[PDB]
Design an enzyme around this catalytic site. Structure first.
Site: not given
Ligand SMILES: CNC(=O)[C@@H](NC(=O)[C@@H]1CN(C(=O)c2cnn(Cc3ccccc3)c2)CC12CN(C(=O)[C@H]1CC1(C)C)C2)[C@@H](C)OCCC1CCCCC1
Lengths: 270, 294
Positions: B13, B16, B127
């Site tokens: 991401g 990281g 999400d």
């Protein structure tokens, strides 16, 4: 904890009110307060904390940060100090500004940048120190950074009442809480009790009980302790709701403000 | 980090890289999210601070667990429990054979339980997509990826959520999010588990809206009071008729179609809540109520 406390939440379509309430009640079990934590730092004096928190509130106004951001920083600071010993005056600004940096990153959509937090320290704190300190604080707090702050309790209560102008009432009660939080002795009272007692001073026992669930007996001691603070606020006339460029009018009451609270603090403690 | 052995890279991401790692001593397998502090001009990323604190508050069987936070050198390691795959990979792997309906029912029930718990905590996930739902090999499913989650002690505003799972009130310009957007996502996922195909795979905001309209019918003030007054509503929108759910989700019985229809209700104020969905007769076989006091 407060076995005499009822549940004031109305019926909720999106969740089970008994479960929502229980979660709010459990916050006091995880997020502790220690009104005597300064005894762990013999070289500090309670007025140093009032000065530091007052300066943080003024920083919040300048950047138009939320009241929640300021109260998160207050709780982080107070809980962090309770985990530490022998802190000296010259490190309080860094601990305070770093607590605010963490709080703004949690709460604001577009928080000020790190270099901005270093800037307001007028060359006393560097960005690298703030980065180091935010990690010290977060680890010492075991990454428990979601307390139910004093001001969030005011929003809960005012929302129960909702479900003259509520926004103006809100900022006037918030301003009394802002004054009380500067006195470390406020930590003797649960954040929810402090918020209910401030609301009582601007309303009645009946409304206080209806929106908070606390019985009069639950807040009597806080109310008596808060009396001098409410009286100095009452004598001045309370402030007025303000407009903030870039902030929607319906969110304006949630923006942290700053007044000459240190003088008021002296008159109250007298 | 001495006792962990990196086994393979399983993700990456903005903040990281994610690795599958094995505890060399205990044999435990974890998901390691490595944050390179040297490269973060603003310190610990705000999304990481928010997600860590939230996961420490949200302990529930259907919520991925955050096992540890390790600060070594100039790296922050988030140690998460490991689940062998996400729901998108499981659905794709099951596309030819189909997912058995009792497993679809168990997963949806578990997803709604985890969601009901988040909503009880006054937290919006925002999400929920198949890639953020993780399964194990024991029949469990868990909500994951709380980076976009926000507490709603005060209204959560919209700012200029994956399109395929975005609620129509968001596409039409609502100024705030609500718990109903999470229910909408699960409704889309429920249909996707049944048909093995995303329900509304739009390629733009307007394509996404029209796709919804072509299936549920073009909204009006009767079915959704206030639609015509919303920011991005256009009186020129084509008039499509609602489709029979027997054609939209054929394998579903009347109880499943009923629940799905309530999870995709246009009106956010009337869309079923997570707790009400758990009480829906579709789940009578998998649960039974408790005696009520008062
Ligand atoms: C400025 N307006 C405000 O803050 C509003 N607040 C809420 O509505 C808040 C935000 N919230 C959400 O965001 C939200 C997200 N999904 N759903 C469910 C949903 C589903 C489908 C469609 C729509 C919604 C809700 C619900 C909300 C009410 N909550 C509670 O926990 C309830 C238990 C309680 C009384 C304390 C949080 C009002 C009520 O407050 C009064 C304003 C006022 C206080 C006094 C001073 C000035 C401001």
């Amino acid at each position: 904890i407060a076995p005499s406390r009822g549940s004031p939440l109305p019926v909720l379509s999106w969740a089970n009110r008994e479960e929502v309430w229980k979660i709010m009640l459990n916050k006091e079990k995880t997020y502790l307060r220690d009104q005597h934590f300064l005894e762990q730092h013999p070289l500090l004096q309670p007025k140093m904390r009032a000065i530091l928190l007052d300066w943080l509130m003024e920083v919040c106004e300048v950047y138009k940060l939320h009241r929640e951001t300021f109260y998160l920083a207050q709780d982080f600071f107070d809980r962090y100090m309770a985990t530490q010993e022998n802190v000296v005056k010259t490190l309080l600004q860094l601990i305070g500004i770093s607590s605010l940096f963490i709080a703004a990153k949690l709460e604001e959509i577009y928080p000020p940048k790190l270099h901005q937090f270093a800037y307001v320290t007028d060359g006393a704190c560097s960005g690298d120190e703030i980065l180091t300190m935010e990690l010290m604080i977060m680890k010492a707090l075991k990454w428990r950074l979601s307390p139910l702050t004093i001001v969030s309790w005011l929003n809960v209560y005012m929302q129960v009442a909702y479900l003259q102008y509520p926004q103006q009432i809100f900022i006037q009660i918030a301003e009394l809480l802002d004054l009380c939080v500067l006195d470390v002795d406020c930590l003797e009272f649960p954040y929810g009790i402090l918020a209910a007692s401030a609301l009582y001073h601007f309303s009645s026992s009946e409304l206080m009980q209806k929106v908070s669930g606390y019985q009069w007996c639950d807040i009597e001691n806080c109310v008596k302790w808060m009396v001098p603070f409410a009286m100095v606020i009452r004598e001045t006339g309370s402030s007025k709701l303000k407009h903030f460029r870039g902030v929607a009018d319906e969110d304006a009451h949630n923006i942290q403000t700053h007044r000459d609270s240190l003088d008021l603090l002296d008159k109250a403690r007298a | 980090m001495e006792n962990f052995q990196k086994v393979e890279k399983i993700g990456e991401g903005t903040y990281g890289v994610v690795y599958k790692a094995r505890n060399k001593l205990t044999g435990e397998v974890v998901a390691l999210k490595k944050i390179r502090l040297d490269t973060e001009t603003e310190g610990v990323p705000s999304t990481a601070i928010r997600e860590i604190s939230l996961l420490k508050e949200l302990n529930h069987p259907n919520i991925v667990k955050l096992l540890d936070v390790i600060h070594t050198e100039n790296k922050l390691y988030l140690v998460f429990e490991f689940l062998h795959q996400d729901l998108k990979k499981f659905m794709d792997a099951s596309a030819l054979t189909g997912i058995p309906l009792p497993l679809i029912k168990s997963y949806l029930f578990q997803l709604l339980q985890g969601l009901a718990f988040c909503h009880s905590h006054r937290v919006l996930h925002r999400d929920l997509k198949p890639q953020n739902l993780l399964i194990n090999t024991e029949g469990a499913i868990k909500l994951a990826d709380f980076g976009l989650a926000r507490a709603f002690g005060v209204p959560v505003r919209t700012y200029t959520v994956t399109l395929w799972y975005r609620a129509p009130e968001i596409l039409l310009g609502c100024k705030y999010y609500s718990t109903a957007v999470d229910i909408w996502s699960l409704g889309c996922i429920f249909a996707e588990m049944v048909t093995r195909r995303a329900l509304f795979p739009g390629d733009s905001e307007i394509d996404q809206l029209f796709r919804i309209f072509r299936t549920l019918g073009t909204p009006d003030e009767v079915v959704w009071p206030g639609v015509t007054s919303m920011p991005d509503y256009k009186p020129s929108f084509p008039k499509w008729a609602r489709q029979d759910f027997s054609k939209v989700v054929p394998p579903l019985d009347e109880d499943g179609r009923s629940l799905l229809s309530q999870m995709l209700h246009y009106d956010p104020n009337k869309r079923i809540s997570a707790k009400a969905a758990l009480a829906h007769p579709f789940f009578q076989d998998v649960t039974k109520p408790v005696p009520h006091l008062r």
